[PDB]
């Protein structure tokens, strides 16, 4: 017939986007609006679904600062598609960019986003479990939120509180690796349970990742993936938090703090949040959303 891919009744089908993917991640428009999105597909005969309900994860995360926008999930063709606002690149991307290596600066108008952002899918019953550069984008050029950092891909998150009892979930061991294990929680290596504190640790590691330019367990490599996982949970155990931040004390504060709080513990986001704005505020810094990655030339969909 047409030859032209549609979700939905407006949403035109386009050119596959990012790296990775294999398919999965495609520029799309809206014929009616006259906007372009970025479309989420999974192949209907999957053998692990997550789409859907990320999609009701996307729902029920609601409208939110940093949040993309959903407009619609439906089938396409053999696939199951969801259409989202469209953003801009992600950290890693712009990590690049800047040659691996982010200013204090820079890392601290992030860390002071992403705790907001994480203390705001926490309030929503929602704990993330995918923490990593990768998946936190900046919005785009122009559509007034570039500035913005978002957080996407909410696939492997899980309702921490039960929506029925009210209550957090129990405690447990000997759940399965399958995260990234770069960023992942001490307590994550272990096969516990992952709970709030695991989202603020992950974010810990990956703002030192950013201020030194690489970790101490990145070029861990075994036989197998538990092996891997094992090693890197040894490294990272083995490696003194004083040491890791290294220069970066309120850093070491943070991450300590998290790595000590309890598994059913409410994280203190306001004063995780403190220690970053007063360094932010003694520093001289201004808050003025000028990254290391303004000025510079960046990628794009389009
Ligand atoms: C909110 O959904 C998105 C919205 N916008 C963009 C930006 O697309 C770009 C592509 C190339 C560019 F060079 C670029 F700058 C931007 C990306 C996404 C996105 C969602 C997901 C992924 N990516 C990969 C993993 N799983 C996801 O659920």
Same mark, same amino acid.
């Given at each position: 017939?047409?030859?032209?891919?549609?979700?939905?009744?407006?949403?035109?089908?386009?050119?596959?986007? $990012?790296? /990775?993917?294999?398919?999965?991640?495609?520029? !799309?428009?809206?014929?009616?609006? #006259?906007?372009? @999105?970025?479309?989420? &597909?999974?192949?209907?005969?999957?053998?692990?679904?997550?789409?859907?309900?990320?999609?009701?994860?996307?729902?029920?995360?609601?409208? $939110?600062? /940093?949040?993309?926008?959903?407009?619609?999930? !439906?089938?396409?063709?053999?696939? #199951?598609?969801? @259409?989202?606002?469209? &953003?801009?690149?992600?950290?890693?991307?712009?990590?690049?960019?800047?040659?691996?290596?982010?200013?204090?600066?820079?890392?601290?108008?992030?860390?002071?986003?992403?705790?907001?952002?994480?203390?705001?899918?926490?309030?929503?019953?929602?704990?993330?479990?995918?923490?990593?550069?990768?998946?936190?984008?900046?919005?785009?050029?122009?559509?007034?939120?570039?500035?913005?950092?978002?957080?996407?891909?909410?696939?492997?998150?899980?309702?921490?509180?039960?929506?029925?009892?009210?209550?957090?979930?129990?405690?447990?061991?000997?759940?399965?690796?399958?995260?990234?294990?770069?960023?992942?929680?001490?307590?994550?290596?272990?096969?516990?349970?992952?709970?709030?504190?695991?989202?603020?640790?992950?974010?810990?590691?990956?703002?030192?990742?950013?201020?030194?330019?690489?970790?101490?367990?990145?070029?861990?490599?075994?036989?197998?993936?538990?092996?891997?996982?094992?090693?890197?949970?040894?490294?990272?155990?083995?490696?003194?938090?004083?040491?890791?931040?290294?220069?970066?004390?309120?850093?070491?504060?943070?991450?300590?703090?998290?790595?000590?709080?309890?598994?059913?513990?409410?994280?203190?986001?306001?004063?995780?949040?403190?220690?970053?704005?007063?360094?932010?505020?003694?520093?001289?810094?201004?808050?003025?959303?000028?990254?290391?990655?303004?000025?510079?030339?960046?990628?794009?969909?389009?």
């Amino acid at each position: 017939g047409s030859g032209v891919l549609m979700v939905g009744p407006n949403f035109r089908v386009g050119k596959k986007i $990012g790296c /990775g993917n294999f398919g999965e991640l495609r520029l !799309g428009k809206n014929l009616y609006t #006259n906007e372009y @999105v970025a479309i989420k &597909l999974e192949p209907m005969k999957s053998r692990a679904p997550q789409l859907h309900l990320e999609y009701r994860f996307y729902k029920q995360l609601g409208s $939110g600062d /940093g949040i993309p926008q959903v407009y619609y999930f !439906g089938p396409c063709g053999k696939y #199951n598609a969801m @259409v989202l606002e469209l &953003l801009g690149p992600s950290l890693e991307d712009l990590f690049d960019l800047c040659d691996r290596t982010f200013s204090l600066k820079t890392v601290l108008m992030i860390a002071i986003q992403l705790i907001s952002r994480m203390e705001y899918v926490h309030s929503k019953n929602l704990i993330y479990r995918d923490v990593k550069p990768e998946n936190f984008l900046i919005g785009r050029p122009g559509n007034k939120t570039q500035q913005v950092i978002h957080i996407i891909d909410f696939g492997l998150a899980k309702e921490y509180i039960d929506p029925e009892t009210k209550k957090h979930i129990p405690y447990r061991e000997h759940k399965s690796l399958t995260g990234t294990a770069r960023y992942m929680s001490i307590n994550t290596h272990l096969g516990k349970e992952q709970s709030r504190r695991d989202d603020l640790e992950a974010l810990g590691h990956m703002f030192m990742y950013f201020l030194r330019g690489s970790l101490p367990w990145q070029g861990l490599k075994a036989d197998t993936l538990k092996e891997r996982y094992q090693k890197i949970g040894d490294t990272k155990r083995a490696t003194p938090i004083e040491v890791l931040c290294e220069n970066f004390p309120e850093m070491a504060t943070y991450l300590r703090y998290v790595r000590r709080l309890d598994f059913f513990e409410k994280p203190d986001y306001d004063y995780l949040r403190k220690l970053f704005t007063d360094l932010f505020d003694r520093k001289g810094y201004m808050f003025d959303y000028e990254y290391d990655w303004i000025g510079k030339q960046l990628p794009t969909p389009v």
